[PDB]
């Protein structure tokens with residue numbers, strides 16, 4: 001044990017999630033990301049199937065790590081006196097969706113469809129595993145640029161999925177539903193669907209629809225870019241003011257805008273230029 005196991009490269013990012021470095025597993029030259037989180041910046045703690053005091057983020061990542069490639073998988077973790085260190089898979093080359101949208105602007109609908117579909121599969125996988133992400137947004141999605149595959153990251157604001165009301169939240173406010181803003185109360189699935197509507201709008205328009213609380217509460221969607229009526233309808237459906245008026249995951253994936261999605265590799269070859 002100990003970081004004789006890993007060679008450390010450049011800082012890849014830092015923010016609310018901690019600090020993430022590029023890394024190489026010395027053992028087999030596996031590319032990895034190395035994420036440092038300060039103990040004092042951790043509020044939510046859980047314990048393992050084993051039963052040790054770990055950050056909730058480790059509990060959640062363990063529950064979603066395995067066969068599916070929709071989430072960036074936890075390979076290992078270490079405790080330090082003042083911090084935890086997490087070793088995560090690193091696709092190469094990779095770009096986060098926020099940066100991809102910054103570089104390219106509003107996405108063509110065919111591309112947004114494939115991207116949005118993969119996000120839905122990823123979020124469904126988390127929920128099936130009993131994990132609520134609570135911070136779905138472009139900054140928390142990585143693109144494996146050669147494979148055309150999207151991967152969910154930073155579960156540091158998430159929770160165990162439950163069927164009762166959540167009264168806490170520490171994700172991104174501008175992706176948070178009106179019921180959180182007004183009442184400080186939400187249910188996990190319908191909150192997630194709201195965040196998915198914001199993300200979808202973000203993809204086809206090149207920015208998020210709401211910046212202020214009053215915009216969120218009003219729920220009035222203005223399309224700033226040319227977007228098909230089918231896409232507008234799905235977006236408007238996801239952004240329903242009443243949580244029960246929002247579509248289920250099945251209803252989203254069965255929507256006419258979602259039909260005939262590109263395969264990931266088709267997506268990379270057409271849009272990411274493989």
Ligand SMILES: O=c1[nH]cnc2c1sc1c(Cl)ccc(Cl)c12
Nearest residue numbers: 012013017020033089090153154
């Ligand atoms: O978990 C993460 N949080 C924040 N950033 C990242 C991760 S993984 C990862 C990988 Cl693999 C490549 C590049 C970045 Cl910036 C991140």
